[PDB]
Amino acid sequence: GNSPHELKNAAQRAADWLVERQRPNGALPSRTAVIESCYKGMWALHTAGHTQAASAVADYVTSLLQPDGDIPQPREERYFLDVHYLYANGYLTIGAHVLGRFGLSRKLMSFVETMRNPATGGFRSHGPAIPGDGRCDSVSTSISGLAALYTGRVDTARSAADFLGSLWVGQPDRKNVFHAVADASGAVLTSDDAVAVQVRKAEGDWYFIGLPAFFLTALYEATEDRAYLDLATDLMTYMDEDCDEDAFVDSSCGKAGVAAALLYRLTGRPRYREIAEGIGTLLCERQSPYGYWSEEETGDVADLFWGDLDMTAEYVLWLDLIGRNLASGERVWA
Amino acid sequence: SPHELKNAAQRAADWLVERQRPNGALPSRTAVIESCYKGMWALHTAGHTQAASAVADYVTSLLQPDGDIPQPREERYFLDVHYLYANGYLTIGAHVLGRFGLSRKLMSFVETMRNPATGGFRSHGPAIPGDGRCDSVSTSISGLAALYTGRVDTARSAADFLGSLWVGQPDRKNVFHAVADASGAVLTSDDAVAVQVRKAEGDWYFIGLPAFFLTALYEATEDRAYLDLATDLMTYMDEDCDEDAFVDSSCGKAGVAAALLYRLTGRPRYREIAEGIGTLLCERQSPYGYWSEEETGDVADLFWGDLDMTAEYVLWLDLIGRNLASGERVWA
Ligand SMILES: CC(=O)N[C@@H](C=O)[C@@H](O)[C@H](O)[C@H](O)CO
Ligand SMILES: O=C[C@H](O)[C@H](O)CO
Ligand SMILES: O=C[C@H](O)[C@H](O)CO
């Protein structure tokens, strides 16, 4: 296994790669100019110490900001339209707030809450102009709840956890499928077109479970309400015993790993470090030597396809969070 | 150059991490909270997130059930001058790090010290003798901690105290009385903090830290009344205060305020103040990375005030550098 020192060095290598190729307007080196290519940029580069590069992304994001606090364009990927439209918005809010861009995050978080379903506590999956039926998913709700934490809107975070709690206990067939979406009225949306994770198979989408586990663990730390800890503990046990191991192998397993590392610092259970260390080590070995993570690229490239840039900035963040909670976990418990 | 200011901050952060204690404490010769209250925030901005979380672990083990850290404390200024100065940086550092339980409890206690009649924050801690007086530094850092934790109403109330303190100055061209009583009237007695604005006797951060907080509140709110008061305090330090206002060790607050004001307004005088202070702080840096007024050798620890100044300059040079680079870009 690799140590938190080595998980961190892998994070700083990718963060160096990004800063080397950042555009003068602040955009990260994406082959296509879309918001889903750099929405984790402010947060990731801040945790890596590249604050001027993170502030540059904040300048690029601010110049794209609409009067209502949203960035509806440039968007291309289908998932950032009607699957989890607020995935970009949630990371933008956290990254702007930790940077001290209080005007940016306040406007981003204001719009995020305009998407909240007051009847259920979830957040709408499709953007204002995107066709949809008002469905709310676990990813939009957990990332908005996490963004609610960093901005101090704890009541919104609490209402988001109620949605995830109701979504968990409403699972009709949890051993075979995880329905990560509810309709606009609070019922678990078991429709064919709704996101549903095939648990016993190896077909990705695990972060629809891992990100709620991350959010719920953070809200527990914020509140020490055991209801949030028990629900996060269930989701982790669910992904460990009931889920196919691809839940900890697929590219979206970093959310589970961050949650396990957080849970280890908060509980001291050794299996949480096991899941956290194995996931963090797994992502380290996949890193290209130039710093970036990618699926098809292997050479000294000057830019990346939008999915690889986002994955690269996402792994700077996940390896850092896992590394700092494993390090603090040993100090506290061991 | 924002590039050079950042490298100086990363060298001081490297110096701190290389000497951090196994329990998370920064290398202070005395185990006191005033030696490392800026450690969580400073190390996080430098990328040393494992070292920042270690400070969070050490701070967490000191937290009392009401959210304060009354011990270990030794410096009088962290007893009855601006007691909450330590708590303010602890709250911010804990929050940007994700330690929401640590930051919420710290912020909860800070708010119990707010004076609801004036919006100011009590200068002396619970155990410490005093008369309910509130100072501009306790109020500014509490307001900035409130902004980072989303307590905007508490921040707006802190600015109201600063605005009341400002227009209430009985003699601003000769002295800045930074304290008011519990009733809201400016305290002019000799025991109150008073900046002799025409003498090189330090304590300028009683004006500069208000200017920083008020500028950040303006960005959070776009209420130009906060920008105007921030502008008046920056003009006050530039034209009416001694040049030591931008030379004393406590000038980093005005520099960060100027760097932030430059990004928001674009007036190049704010860029001059930020660069001048930033390069000044850069030139005072020892080659090993730490900042000290006495030490020059390769030391394994520092006097608590030198260790705090070292972490403080990590943050200020980063803030000054990030706002000058972004200020250069938007006003290109
Ligand atoms: C660099 C500097 O002069 N900083 C000032 C405030 O931040 C100073 O008052 C410090 O707090 C010092 O530890 C004494 O209190
Ligand atoms: O890198 C992956 C992106 O987050 C998106 O989910 C596309 O797969
Ligand atoms: O040690 C130097 C600090 O800046 C301060 O003077 C301590 O009181």
A56 is written with which tokens?
């540059």
User: Strand (E) positions, chain B?
Assistant: 134-135, 176-177, 179-180, 194-195
- At B226 the three-state DSSP class reads helix
Bridge partners of residue A304, in order along the sequence? A30
Report the distance separating Cα A87 and Cα A83, nearest Å: 9
In order, the DSSP letters of A79-146 are IIIII-THHHHHHHHHHHHHTT-HHHHHHHHHHHHHTB-TTTS-BBSS-TTS-----EEHHHHHHHHH
Rounded CA separation A262/A188 (Å): 28
Peptide bond into A74 cis (omega under 30): yes
Is B224:A103 a contact under the CB 8 Å cutoff?
A: no
Q: Does domain B2-330 have CATH number 1.50.10.20?
A: yes
User: Does B6 sit within 8 Å of A331, measured CB to CB?
Assistant: no
Reported as type and span, the H/E element at residue B108 is helix B100-112
Specify whether the CB–CB gap between B165 and B187 falls below 8 A: no
In this structure, the number of other CB atoms found within 10 A of the CB of residue A1 comes to 11
Pick A4-333's CATH classification: 1.10.760.10, 1.50.10.20, 2.60.40.10, 1.20.1090.10: 1.50.10.20
Using CB atoms within 10 Å of the CB of residue B134, give its burial: 0 to 12 exposed, 13 to 18 middle, 19+ buried. Answer: buried
Which residue out of B32, B74, B249, B285 has the highest number of ligand 3 atoms within 8 Å of its CB and is therefore the one to mutate? Answer: B249
A124: nearest Cα among A136, A114, A113: A136
Q: Which atom of ligand 2 is nearest to the CA of A308?
A: 1
Q: Which two tokens stand for residue B84?
A: 């909450």
Calculate ∠ Cα B251-B257-B261, nearest 5°. Answer: 145
Tell me A188's DSSP state. Answer: B
Residues of A in contact with B53 (CB under 8 A): 324-325, 327-328
User: How were these coordinates obtained?
Assistant: X-ray
Residue type, B268: P
Report H helices in chain A: 4-20, 41-47, 51-64, 86-98, 102-114, 138-150, 154-169, 207-223, 226-237, 254-267, 270-285, 306-333
- Give the distance between the most distant pair of CA atoms in chain B: 53
**HSE toward the beta carbon, residue A251, CA cutoff 13 A:** 12
Residues 6+ apart with CB under 8 A from A145: A156, A157, A160, A161, A164, A215, A219
Cα–Cα distance measured from residue A195 to residue A206, given in angstroms and rounded to the nearest whole number:
11
What is the distance between the alpha carbons of residues A85 and B86, in angstroms, rounded to a whole number?
40
Which among B243, B171, B231 has a CA at the least distance from the CA of B204? B243
Contacts of A26 in chain B (CB under 8 A): 329
Q: Which residue has the tokens 């000769």?
A: B174
- B95 to chain A: closest CA residue: A150
User: What is the experimental resolution, given in Å to one decimal place?
Assistant: 2.1
Domain edges within chain A: 4-333
Integer CA distances (angstroms), B199 to B176, B242, B314, in order: 12, 6, 28
Cα B30 from Cα B25, distance rounded (Å): 10
Cβ separation A323–B45 shorter than 8 A: no
CA distance A208 to A142: 9
User: Which positions ≥6 away from A38 have C-beta within 8 Å?
Assistant: A27, A28, A30, A57, A60, A61, A309, A310, A313
Other C-beta atoms lying within 10 Å of the C-beta of residue B83? 25
Question: How far, in Å, from the CA of A316 to the mean position of ligand 2?
Answer: 15
CA–CA separation, A50 and B53 (whole Å): 18
Q: Which of A18, A110, A331 to mutate to test the interface with B (most CBs of B within 10 A)?
A: A331
Dist. CA B6–CA A331, nearest whole Å? 30
In the three-class reduction of DSSP (H, G, I as helix; E, B as strand; rest coil), residue A165 is classed as helix
The three-state DSSP-derived secondary structure of A292-306 is CCCCCCCCCCCCECH
**Contact yes or no for A42/A315 (Cβ under 8 A):** no
8-state DSSP, A240: I
- CB-CB under 8 Å, A51 with B321: yes
Residues A70, A75, A78, CA angle at the centre, nearest 5°? 115
* Cβ of B305 below 6 Å from ligand 1: yes
Q: Measuring CA to CA, which residue among B101, B100, B164 is closest to residue B136?
A: B164
Rounded distance between C-alpha atoms, residue B98 and residue A150, angstroms? 7
**DSSP secondary-structure letter at B114?**
B
Phi-psi region of B188 (alpha: psi -120 to 50; beta: other; left: phi over 0): alpha
**Cβ-proximal residues to A322 (8 Å cutoff; 6+ apart), any chain:** A4, A7, A254, A257, A258, A260, A261, A276, A279, A280
